[PDB]
């Protein structure tokens, strides 16, 4: 779902917020994987690994169906859960997409989740892309 990107922003693309210390879990995992700086721009969510290498990886904001927060219990700060529109195809394999699950989870190990969640919301609402 993530594609390679140089990290530079396109011509009418602005940085909205950036945050160190964010890990990205896949579906319901709980040890894979990654740990790093998250960037939200007007068009994209861009990830960039700690010491580089490599990366960068980005998804378009138009790919996001819905977002929500999920509690860590009696911890400090919620995970942001991002639901993605599916790919397709392309004929032959396939198999079944129902047994695969279709969202990612952002955990904020160095905090700043509230601020990020708010910014992501506003970008989702305004669709400036």
């Amino acid at each position: 779902r993530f594609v390679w990107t140089s990290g530079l922003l396109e011509i009418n693309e602005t940085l909205v917020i950036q945050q160190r210390g964010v890990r990205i879990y896949d579906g319901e995992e709980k040890i894979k994987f990654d740990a790093g700086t998250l960037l939200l721009s007007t068009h994209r969510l861009i990830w960039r690994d700690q010491k580089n290498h490599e990366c960068c990886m980005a998804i378009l904001l138009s790919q996001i169906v819905f977002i929500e927060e999920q509690a860590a219990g009696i911890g400090k700060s919620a995970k942001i859960v991002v639901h993605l529109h599916p790919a397709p195809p392309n004929k032959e394999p396939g198999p079944f997409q129902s047994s695969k699950n279709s969202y990612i989870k952002l955990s904020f190990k160095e905090h700043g989740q509230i601020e990020f969640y708010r910014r992501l919301s506003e970008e989702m609402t305004q669709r400036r892309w």
Binding site: F66, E68, V81, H85, P86, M124, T125, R127
Partner: protein, 73 residues
């Protein structure tokens, strides 16, 4: 009136509704056609979640519009 609901398998569901139908009632139709219990369903139009008590007209959902189903975690 026909509306569409895209789910995250890529499946499009076609429903028969009227603008006066509550979201609760739409969710019920999905359980009828697809088997998903209303209580796990969430419905999104524009980018915002839709409220159970309210109607398709209240959200201005017209002929051929597309909602998106996203299940509860």
């Amino acid at each position: 009136m026909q509306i569409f609901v895209k789910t995250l398998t890529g499946k499009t569901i076609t429903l028969e509704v009227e603008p006066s139908d509550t979201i609760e009632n739409v969710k019920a139709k999905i359980q009828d056609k697809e088997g998903i219990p209303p209580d796990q369903q969430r419905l999104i139009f524009a980018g915002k979640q839709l409220e159970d008590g309210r109607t398709l007209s209240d959200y201005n959902i017209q002929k051929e519009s597309t909602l998106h189903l996203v299940l509860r975690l």
